[PDB]
Design a protein around this ligand. Structure first.
Ligand SMILES: Cc1cn([C@H]2C[C@H](OP(=O)(O)O)[C@@H](COP(=O)(O)O)O2)c(=O)[nH]c1=O
Ligand SMILES: [Ca+2]
Length: 129
């Protein structure tokens, strides 16, 4: 997999953000994770965490997996990095997302994220509390 450039346009919620990619606006949905909706418990915390991580980053990068790059809603599906730190992983490690939506052929970082979820759960963090 390869990291490609993007810039933040606007935060949206815990697991979606609006980025400019190849000079086009796109909503990106983070691969392999599920955050609570804003209206749900920890939903506000997950939105805040993703907004802060993206807005503070000097460098945002998109990394597509091997399989589908856009979902049925036209959202880009990717791993998103902020100054080299994967936002998908960081949410799960903090207990602000669960590993979820693991489809065959877009699951390169599944085991990395499951390890982070196990550690968040052992710490009883947030969703696991
Ligand atoms: C994360 C992800 C979601 N989706 C679709 C599945 C779900 O369909 P439904 O909308 O029919 O439930 C929806 C979940 O996204 P959200 O969690 O953003 O709502 O996004 C994919 O198709 N591929 C993916 O990799
Ligand atoms: Ca969600």
């Amino acid at each position: 997999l390869h990291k490609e450039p993007a810039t933040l346009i606007k935060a949206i919620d815990g697991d979606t953000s609006k980025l400019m990619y190849k000079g086009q606006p796109m909503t990106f949905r983070l691969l392999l994770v599920d955050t609570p909706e804003f209206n749900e418990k920890y939903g506000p915390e997950a939105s805040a965490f993703t907004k802060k991580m993206a807005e503070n980053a000097k460098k945002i990068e998109v990394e597509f997996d091997k399989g589908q790059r856009t979902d049925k809603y036209g959202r880009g599906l990717a791993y998103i990095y902020a100054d080299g730190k994967m936002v998908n992983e960081a949410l799960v490690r903090q207990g602000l997302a669960k590993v979820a939506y693991v489809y065959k052929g877009n699951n390169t970082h599944e085991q990395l994220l499951r390890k982070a979820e196990a550690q968040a759960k052992k710490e009883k963090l947030n969703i696991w509390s």
